Amino acid sequence: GFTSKDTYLSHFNPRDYLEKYYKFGSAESQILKHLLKNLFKIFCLDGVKGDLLIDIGSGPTIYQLLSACESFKEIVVTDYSDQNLQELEKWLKAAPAAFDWSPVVTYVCDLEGNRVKGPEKEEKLRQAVKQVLKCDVTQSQPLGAVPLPPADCVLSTLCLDAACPDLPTYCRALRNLGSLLKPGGFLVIMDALKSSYYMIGEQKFSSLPLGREAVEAAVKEAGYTIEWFEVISQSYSSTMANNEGLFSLVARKL
Ligand SMILES: Nc1ncnc2c1ncn2[C@@H]1O[C@H](CSCC[C@H](N)C(=O)O)[C@@H](O)[C@H]1O
Ligand SMILES: CNc1cc(C)c(C(N)=O)c[n+]1C
């Protein structure tokens, strides 16, 4: 009774997803602001840095990487959907048909103290992203046959509830992402709480409805130690999903 992963290849419209959730012109904008403040805190205020960050289930979005590119030499973006990766690549290659992230970029520049302007920030992100890869979090080797050095950080925003049909798969996915991480490496997860679906227009997608206790327990079971865990009550618009807030966590691999 859960969305099949092949539905992501064919029925997840990347430009419609961006239009629906990331236009930043709403509950969606309030959530985006909070996600950005947390990412800024992690990568710029806390010591989350290194040579390599792997972003898991990036979809067609870059917002989750804007603060990260200040702290990581290389960012690898990954997703199950080739269509999502193509939409991402349109922005990376600064193509005229690319999504306009400029209000989000400006917001991050403001958070970071206006040290740089939008164009410099976008260029820094474009230079950090060297690889755009296929991933499947449900597999023991999420990146398949593709070899990568162990990462300093694995980040995943709004992916794991959508990718995991049940709690045992969710715990296994956390172990699978851990295989990409160096010992003592950072795991950064942000996702919806108690959400059983989300919509992109008329297209419905399943979500695993987890509470904060189940998320914490799965992260400890998967071999991590939690540094901090935050719950926000703000939910997406009623037309989009049925979540009861969002969580953010930073953990280290044992
Ligand atoms: N098994 C799986 N492994 C990896 N990615 C998967 C997956 N099942 C679904 N996904 C991806 O999970 C994403 C959910 S959308 C979240 C996109 C983005 N990180 C954001 O913050 O908005 C989609 O891009 C979808 O292709
Ligand atoms: C904004 N993107 C969202 C939003 C929600 C609420 C869910 C979910 N897990 O229900 C998944 N995605 C990918």
Swiss-Prot record:
<feature type="binding site">
    <location>
        <position position="157"/>
    </location>
    <ligand>
        <name>S-adenosyl-L-methionine</name>
    </ligand>
</feature>
<comment type="function">
    <text>Catalyzes the N-methylation of nicotinamide using the universal methyl donor S-adenosyl-L-methionine to form N1-methylnicotinamide and S-adenosyl-L-homocysteine, a predominant nicotinamide/vitamin B3 clearance pathway. Plays a central role in regulating cellular methylation potential, by consuming S-adenosyl-L-methionine and limiting its availability for other methyltransferases. Actively mediates genome-wide epigenetic and transcriptional changes through hypomethylation of repressive chromatin marks, such as H3K27me3.</text>
</comment>
<feature type="binding site">
    <location>
        <position position="22"/>
    </location>
    <ligand>
        <name>S-adenosyl-L-methionine</name>
    </ligand>
</feature>
<feature type="binding site">
    <location>
        <position position="207"/>
    </location>
    <ligand>
        <name>nicotinamide</name>
    </ligand>
</feature>
<dbReference type="GO" id="GO:0032259">
    <property type="term" value="P:methylation"/>
</dbReference>
<keyword id="KW-0949">S-adenosyl-L-methionine</keyword>
<dbReference type="GO" id="GO:0005829">
    <property type="term" value="C:cytosol"/>
</dbReference>
<comment type="similarity">
    <text>Belongs to the class I-like SAM-binding methyltransferase superfamily. NNMT/PNMT/TEMT family.</text>
</comment>
<keyword id="KW-0808">Transferase</keyword>
<keyword id="KW-0963">Cytoplasm</keyword>
<dbReference type="GO" id="GO:0090312">
    <property type="term" value="P:positive regulation of protein deacetylation"/>
</dbReference>
<feature type="modified residue" description="Citrulline; alternate">
    <location>
        <position position="175"/>
    </location>
</feature>
<comment type="pathway">
    <text>Amino-acid degradation.</text>
</comment>
<dbReference type="InterPro" id="IPR000940">
    <property type="entry name" value="NNMT_TEMT_trans"/>
</dbReference>
<dbReference type="GO" id="GO:0006769">
    <property type="term" value="P:nicotinamide metabolic process"/>
</dbReference>
<feature type="binding site">
    <location>
        <position position="191"/>
    </location>
    <ligand>
        <name>nicotinamide</name>
    </ligand>
</feature>
<feature type="modified residue" description="N6-acetyllysine">
    <location>
        <position position="33"/>
    </location>
</feature>
<feature type="binding site">
    <location>
        <position position="84"/>
    </location>
    <ligand>
        <name>S-adenosyl-L-methionine</name>
    </ligand>
</feature>
<feature type="modified residue" description="Citrulline; alternate">
    <location>
        <position position="15"/>
    </location>
</feature>
<comment type="pathway">
    <text>Cofactor metabolism.</text>
</comment>
<keyword id="KW-0489">Methyltransferase</keyword>
<keyword id="KW-0007">Acetylation</keyword>
<dbReference type="InterPro" id="IPR025820">
    <property type="entry name" value="NNMT/PNMT/TEMT_CS"/>
</dbReference>
<protein>
    <recommendedName>
        <fullName>Nicotinamide N-methyltransferase</fullName>
        <ecNumber>2.1.1.1</ecNumber>
    </recommendedName>
</protein>
<feature type="binding site">
    <location>
        <position position="57"/>
    </location>
    <ligand>
        <name>S-adenosyl-L-methionine</name>
    </ligand>
</feature>
<comment type="subunit">
    <text>Monomer.</text>
</comment>
<dbReference type="InterPro" id="IPR053384">
    <property type="entry name" value="SAM-dep_methyltransferase"/>
</dbReference>
<keyword id="KW-0164">Citrullination</keyword>
<dbReference type="GO" id="GO:0008112">
    <property type="term" value="F:nicotinamide N-methyltransferase activity"/>
</dbReference>
<feature type="binding site">
    <location>
        <position position="79"/>
    </location>
    <ligand>
        <name>S-adenosyl-L-methionine</name>
    </ligand>
</feature>
<dbReference type="InterPro" id="IPR029063">
    <property type="entry name" value="SAM-dependent_MTases_sf"/>
</dbReference>
<feature type="modified residue" description="Citrulline; alternate">
    <location>
        <position position="126"/>
    </location>
</feature>
<feature type="binding site">
    <location>
        <begin position="136"/>
        <end position="137"/>
    </location>
    <ligand>
        <name>S-adenosyl-L-methionine</name>
    </ligand>
</feature>
<feature type="binding site">
    <location>
        <position position="17"/>
    </location>
    <ligand>
        <name>S-adenosyl-L-methionine</name>
    </ligand>
</feature>
<dbReference type="Pfam" id="PF01234">
    <property type="entry name" value="NNMT_PNMT_TEMT"/>
</dbReference>
<dbReference type="GO" id="GO:0030760">
    <property type="term" value="F:pyridine N-methyltransferase activity"/>
</dbReference>
<dbReference type="GO" id="GO:0045722">
    <property type="term" value="P:positive regulation of gluconeogenesis"/>
</dbReference>
<feature type="binding site">
    <location>
        <position position="63"/>
    </location>
    <ligand>
        <name>S-adenosyl-L-methionine</name>
    </ligand>
</feature>
